[PDB]
Design a protein around this ligand. Structure first.
Ligand SMILES: NC(=O)c1ccc[n+]([C@@H]2O[C@H](COP(=O)([O-])OP(=O)(O)OC[C@H]3O[C@@H](n4cnc5c(N)ncnc54)[C@H](O)[C@@H]3O)[C@@H](O)[C@H]2O)c1
Ligand SMILES: NC(=O)c1ccc[n+]([C@@H]2O[C@H](COP(=O)([O-])OP(=O)(O)OC[C@H]3O[C@@H](n4cnc5c(N)ncnc54)[C@H](O)[C@@H]3O)[C@@H](O)[C@H]2O)c1
Ligand SMILES: NC(=O)c1ccc[n+]([C@@H]2O[C@H](COP(=O)([O-])OP(=O)(O)OC[C@H]3O[C@@H](n4cnc5c(N)ncnc54)[C@H](O)[C@@H]3O)[C@@H](O)[C@H]2O)c1
Ligand SMILES: NC(=O)c1ccc[n+]([C@@H]2O[C@H](COP(=O)([O-])OP(=O)(O)OC[C@H]3O[C@@H](n4cnc5c(N)ncnc54)[C@H](O)[C@@H]3O)[C@@H](O)[C@H]2O)c1
Lengths: 258, 258, 258, 257
C-alpha cells in the first residue's frame, strides 16, 4: 500500500494553500510532520511541530535540523514547497530580481538539503525505499512564458537540480530519492497575483480574460485545487515510490502535454 | 487518502509479471478487480473475476464489457497492461512484424477503450475525479534503442494516444482521465527475453554483460521489481489523481532523466 | 559551410506545399534531386528527375532505387515528406482509419528505408558526415491534441522510429544519420483541411476562429510558410550536421516550448 | 543559408567551440565582433576582437558602444562564454553555485539587456529577425552525478531562452531566441570535467571516463568543435525565421537514448 508509517517529514511553506493540504495528506498517511513557514505562529492541521523558518536562512535550517535530531534522529521526507513568483518585463528587470527569485526558489533547496543531509542519510538507513526529497518546480520549469523569465528560469533550475541530486545520492550509496513536482495552474493567492500583474503589464485585456485563457490551456478545463497536490507528494514520500528518482512528477491537468 | 473504494477495475495481461502485482496492489486498495489474460483459466490473487481475453479481439472486449455491465453497471479504471516485445535487426524485420507488435500494444487500447467507453462514461459519473484509463508505455516510448525499432515505435504510439484521448475525453465532458505509464528495466520474463534476444543478435557479448550494462544505465543502480509498479497505478486510478491527465507517469529508477 | 555539393537526394511528396519548397532549397544548395509524388508527371522546380511513386508500395520504392542505382550508384539524402492527416472523434473512428494513416505516415518510412538501405550505405561511404534520412513528424508527434488521435499517434511513431534507426545504423557501422523534423502550423492545404474538418466536427465555431486560435498558440504569433522548412532540411542533409542523429529538429515558431 | 550583412557578437570566442563559431560565421559572410577574457587570441575571421568579462555590465556597454558606432545594429548575439565545475554536492559552497550562475546565466541576462536596443535595430533590418543563440548543454536536458552546479545553470539557460523568445515576440521586437545543446565535444572543458571526475573517484581513470562518455553517444564518438558551427550559422540566418524558443541539439544522439 501507499502509506507513510514512521516517516518523519519536514514540509516548508506549510502555512500556504498547497502547504496546508500537503501536511493534512501526509498526516492522514500517518507521517510525523515538522511544518515550517515565515509566520511566527500558525495552526497547521496535522503538524506535530510548527517552526517559524525563512528558507533563505541557513540558521533557520539549522534550527529545523536541531529539532528533528533531538526528537527523532532522522528525516525520512523533505518537501521543499516554499517558493515565490514575480511577473516582469525582462528589459525592466534588475539582475537583483533574478537573484532574489533564485535565493528563495533554488538556494533554499541547496542550503536545506545540505543542512538536513546527515538526517536524510539516517532516513536512507531506516527504509529500504530510501529517504525522499520532493522539490516543487512548476509547469513553468517545463514550458516557458512571456513575462515570467525570472520565475520559469528558477523552476527549470529546481527541476534539473532534482535530477542531479537523485543521480549523485544514488551513486554515493546514500539511499535518498530526489524528484521534482510540476503543478499546473493551482487556485492559490500566488496564481491570483500572477494573473493581476499580467493585466498590469498589459499581457491580458482583463483579469477575467487572463483567467479564462489559463483555464482553457489546461485540457482538463479548469484550475487545480490545492488538495489535488497532496496524494502525489504522499506517493513520492512513500516506499511505494522506491523505483522513482530523478523524475518529473507532473500534476498539471494535461497543460504541458498539449 | 489514496484508495480505490468502490472502484471497478479491468486489468489486461493480468497473469503476467507486472499484471499479478497490479491486481494485488489494487485489491489491497479495496478495488473490485476484473482480471483478463490469454489463458483459459488462472488463479490471479486478488481478482474478483477472471476472463480469458485476447486484447486484439473486439468480441473478447465485448465479453469483458458484458460482465462489468451485468455485475456493476460501470468501469471506474481500465489498465491496458497486455503487451509484447520483439528484438530484431531492422533490415531483417518485415512490415508484418511492426504490424503484429502494433496490433497487441496499440490496437488493444483503441478497440478496448472504444468497447468500454459507455461503461467508462458511467465511471465518470460515479467519481468526481473521473474514470481512469492507464496505458502501459515504456521508457522505450521516451528514448530509442538499437534493435528495438518495432517495440519502441509501438510504445511511443501508446504514449501519444494517451495524450490525445486525455485531451479529447476532457473536451467532450466525459470525465475520463487517460495517462501513460513508463516502466524502466523491470525484472520480468519480458526483460529476460529482450536480453536473451540481444545476445542471439550479437548486440551483447553475453546475458551477464547485457544485464550489468542495463543496471548501470539506471541511476538507482538496479532493475526494478514488478511490485514497484503497483503503487503508481493505484495512485493514477484513485481520486487523489483527479488533476492528472495526459501525463507521462515514469517509474524508471531515473533511466530517462540521465 | 552548409551545402549539398554531390548530394543525391530522394524527396517524397515532392509535389505538395512543403515538398516543392524542399526541392527548391536543396537544388539551391547544389543537390541532385530525385522528386517523387502520386501524380504521373509534374513540373517540380529544381528536380533533376521526377517519378510517379506511391510511398505505400514496395514496387514503387524499387523503381526509385533502380533510377538512383543506374544514374548515381548511391543515395546521400532521403527525405520522407509524403504524409496524410484525418480529424475525427475517437469513438467514431474505425481501426481501419488508424491503419490507413499508419500505412502512409509510418509504413512508407519502413518500406522506403529498407529498399534504399544498400544505396544509403553507399552514401555512408561517400561522405564522412554520412548519408542523411530526414523523417517528417509534426509538433503533433511531441504534443497531443483533441480530435487528432490517429494523426498525432502516427507522428509520435515517426519520431521514435527515427531515434531507433539512428541508433541502430550507427551501432552497425553504416554511417547513416536519421533525424525527425517537427513542423508547427504551416500554411499548406493539409492545415487548411484540418481546420475545415475541425469546423465540420463542431470542434471550432468557424474557420476564422480556428485559424486565430492556432496562430495565437505559436509564440511567434503566425502560421509558418512552407519555404521556412527548407533551410532546416538542407542543414540536416549536409555534412555541417555530421554530429546530428536521433534528434528532434523542431521548426514550430515556439509552439511546443510554451 | 547565409549571413550576408549580419553583424554578430560572439562571446567566449577564444575557446574550443568559440574559434570554430567565428570561422563558420565569417565563411557565411557575417561581420563578427569576437570577445573573450584574453587580451589576444588565435581567432581567425573576427572583424573586431574585444577583451570582455561577460559578468561585467561595463564590459557589455563597451561591446554595445563599438557595434553602435561601427554598424548601428546587432543582427546575431551568440552567448558562448561558459564555465564548468565538478564537485560533490555536500562539499559545494553556495558561492560555487553562484559563480557558475554568474558566468553561465547572468552573462545572458546582462548582455541581452545591454544589447537589446541594438537587437531591436536587427529586428527591423531582417524579416527573419535578430537572433540570440544561448549555449546550454545536453546537461541542461539530462542530469548527471557531480555536475549539479553546471547542469542547473545550463537548464536555467535553456528555460531563459524559451521565456525571452516568447516575450520578445509578444512585445513585437522581431528577436528570435534559441538554446543550443552540445553533447560531449572534444574541448579543454570536457577534458577538465573528465580529469576532475577521476580526482573525485567517479571514474577509475581518464581513459575509462572517456570510453564510457563515447559509448553513451549513439554515433559512438565525441564531437569536434567544428561540428557546432553550421547549427549556429543556421539559427543566426533568415533560413531559421520560424525557429524560436527551440532546443537545438547537436549531441550525437546522447539525449534521445
Ligand atoms: N504552475 C504554477 O505556476 C504554480 C502555481 C501554484 C503553485 N506552484 C508551486 O506550488 C508551491 C507552493 O506555492 P503556493 O501556490 O501554495 O503559493 P503560496 O504563496 O500560497 O505559498 C507559498 C509558501 O511559501 C512561503 N514562503 C515564501 N518565501 C519564503 C521564505 N523565504 N521562507 C519560508 N517560506 C516562504 C510563503 O509564506 C507561502 O506560505 C510553489 O513552490 C510553486 O512551485 C506552482
Ligand atoms: N521497460 C520496458 O520496456 C518494460 C518493462 C517491463 C514491462 N513493460 C510493459 O509493461 C507491461 C507488462 O509486461 P510484463 O513485463 O508483465 O510482461 P509479461 O510478458 O510478463 O506479461 C504480459 C502479459 O500480457 C499478456 N498478453 C500478451 N499478448 C496478449 C493478447 N493478445 N491478449 C491478452 N493478453 C496478452 C501475456 O499473456 C502476459 O501475461 C507490458 O505492456 C510491457 O510492454 C515495459
Ligand atoms: N503541424 C503539422 O502537423 C504539419 C503541418 C504541415 C505539414 N506537416 C507534415 O509535413 C509533410 C508535408 O505535408 P504538406 O503540408 O506539404 O501536405 P500536402 O498535402 O501539401 O503534401 C503532402 C504530399 O504527400 C503526398 N502523398 C500522400 N499520400 C501519398 C502516397 N501514398 N504516396 C506518395 N505521395 C503521397 C501528397 O500527394 C502530397 O503531395 C507531411 O508529412 C505533414 O504531415 C505537418
Ligand atoms: N555538453 C556540454 O556540456 C558542453 C560541451 C562543450 C561545450 N559546452 C558549452 O559550449 C560553450 C563553449 O565552451 P568550450 O567547450 O569551448 O569551453 P572553453 O573553456 O574551451 O571555452 C569557453 C571560453 O569562454 C571564456 N570565458 C570564461 N569565462 C569568461 C568570462 N567571465 N568572460 C568572458 N569570457 C569567458 C573562456 O576564456 C573560454 O575561452 C560553453 O558555454 C560550454 O558550457 C557544453
Amino acid at each position: 500500500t501507499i502509506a507513510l508509517n514512521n516517516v518523519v517529514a519536514v514540509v516548508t511553506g506549510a502555512a500556504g494553500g498547497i502547504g496546508r493540504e500537503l501536511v493534512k495528506a501526509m498526516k492522514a498517511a500517518n507521517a510525523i510532520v515538522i511544518a515550517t513557514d515565515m509566520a511566527p505562529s500558525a495552526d497547521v492541521e496535522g503538524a506535530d511541530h510548527y517552526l517559524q523558518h525563512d528558507v533563505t536562512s541557513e540558521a533557520g535550517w539549522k534550527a529545523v535540523a536541531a529539532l528533528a535530531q533531538e526528537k527523532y534522529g532522522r528525516v525520512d521526507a523533505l518537501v521543499h514547497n516554499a517558493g515565490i513568483s514575480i511577473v516582469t518585463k525582462f528589459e525592466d528587470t534588475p539582475l537583483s530580481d533574478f537573484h532574489r527569485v533564485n535565493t528563495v526558489n533554488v538556494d533554499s533547496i541547496i542550503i536545506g538539503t545540505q543542512v538536513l543531509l546527515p538526517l536524510l542519510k539516517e532516513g536512507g538507513k531506516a527504509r529500504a525505499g530510501g529517504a525522499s526529497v520532493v522539490n516543487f518546480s512548476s509547469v513553468g520549469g517545463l514550458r516557458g512564458a512571456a513575462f515570467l523569465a525570472a520565475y520559469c528560469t528558477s523552476k527549470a533550475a529546481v527541476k534539473m537540480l532534482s535530477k542531479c541530486l537523485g543521480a549523485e545520492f544514488a551513486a554515493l550509496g546514500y539511499n535518498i530519492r530526489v524528484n521534482s513536482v510540476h503543478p499546473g495552474g493551482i487556485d492559490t493567492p500566488m496564481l491570483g497575483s500572477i494573473m493581476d500583474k499580467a493585466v498590469e503589464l498589459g499581457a491580458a485585456p482583463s483579469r477575467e480574460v487572463a483567467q479564462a485563457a489559463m483555464e482553457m490551456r489546461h485540457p482538463i478545463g479548469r484550475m487545480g485545487r490545492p488538495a489535488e497536490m497532496g496524494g502525489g507528494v504522499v506517493y513520492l514520500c512513500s516506499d511505494a515510490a522506491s523505483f522513482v528518482t530523478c523524475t518529473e512528477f507532473v500534476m498539471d491537468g494535461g497543460f504541458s502535454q498539449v
